[PDB]
């Protein structure tokens, strides 16, 4: 699941620095705002997302950020 989010984020930031993807975390289709900076900082934003749903997105955001820098 958390790996499947990194896949969709990676496919979104290929032709644009800002995109929106749909993620099915757990029993809900969550709209997800994906953003990247020139320096390479990724922010994943979920709106109207339950704390739980927000934390899984923070875990995915940290995992992909380490892959970006490395």
């Amino acid at each position, epitope marked *: 699941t958390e790996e499947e989010i990194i896949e*969709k984020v*990676k*496919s*979104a*930031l*290929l*032709s*644009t*620095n*800002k*995109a*929106v*993807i*749909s993620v099915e975390l757990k029993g809900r289709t969550i*709209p997800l705002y994906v953003e*990247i900076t*020139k320096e*390479g900082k990724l922010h994943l934003t979920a709106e109207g997302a339950t704390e739980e749903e927000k934390e899984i997105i923070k875990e995915a955001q940290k995992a992909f950020q380490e892959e970006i820098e490395h």
Partner: antibody, heavy 125, light 110 residues
């Protein structure tokens, strides 16, 4: 003179193979992602495949996955497309297209800004 | 699947020189402003007109303008001219696979 020039198209039988080439000119080839986009005769456009500048990401349309292989040689400023298990539906004009979005640049552009004239691929017995 | 389907409309359009032309593109999911517009004349490679949802490419005449954000987009030709008779494609670039619309063919009214 920013341009992309395709080569390698021709008549091919079904189930066989063909290798398309694309030569870049007038721009830094190692900074852009490059795409293959095909157009069936009298029909719309269809994205086939794309490669990032360092070949770090490679994408294929579901209609050509497993059969097509894209690769690039930034030393020769050349793009290649290896087509295997060719079918009649693969008959189209194949464009070599440069993506305008360069990650890490100061001023961003978007879309498909540089197209080649295309090379025609006919799959028929 | 994650693939975003582009829907062009109308399939064909007939207009006279001087008229105002509006072409529509609809996305199956949200694409924000990651939408481009292309012009293709007969037997020629597509030419990029507008890359941001409203940002005109360099060299593109001012009569072309684009609009929309999300899943509903429009391309406007304020005063169509003779060289504007072609096929117009929309293309999203929110996420791969890159996808195009079917296209709208603008024809000469008679």
């Amino acid at each position: 003179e920013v341009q992309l020039v395709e080569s390698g198209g021709g008549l091919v039988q079904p189930r066989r193979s063909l290798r398309l080439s694309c030569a870049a000119s007038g721009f830094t080839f190692d900074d852009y992602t490059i795409h293959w986009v095909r157009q069936a005769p009298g029909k719309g456009l269809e994205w086939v495949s794309g490669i990032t500048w360092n070949s770090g990401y490679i994408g294929y349309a579901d209609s050509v996955k497993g059969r097509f292989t894209i690769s690039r040689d930034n030393a020769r400023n050349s793009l290649y497309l290896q087509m295997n298990s060719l079918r009649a539906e693969d008959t189209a004009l194949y464009y070599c297209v440069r993506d305008a979005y360069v990650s890490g640049s100061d001023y961003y552009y978007y879309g498909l800004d540089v197209w080649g004239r295309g090379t025609l691929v006919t799959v028929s017995s | 699947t994650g693939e975003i389907v582009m829907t062009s409309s109308p399939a064909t359009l007939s207009v006279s020189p001087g008229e105002r032309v509006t072409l529509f593109c609809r996305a199956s999911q949200s694409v924000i402003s990651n939408l481009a517009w292309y012009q293709q004349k007969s037997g020629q490679a597509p030419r990029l007109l507008i890359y941001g949802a409203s940002t005109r490419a360099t060299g593109i005449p001012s009569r072309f303008s684009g609009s929309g954000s999300g899943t509903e987009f429009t391309l406007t030709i304020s005063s169509l001219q003779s060289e504007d008779f072609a096929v117009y494609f929309c293309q999203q670039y929110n996420n791969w696979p890159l996808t195009f619309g079917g296209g709208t063919q603008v024809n000469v009214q008679r």
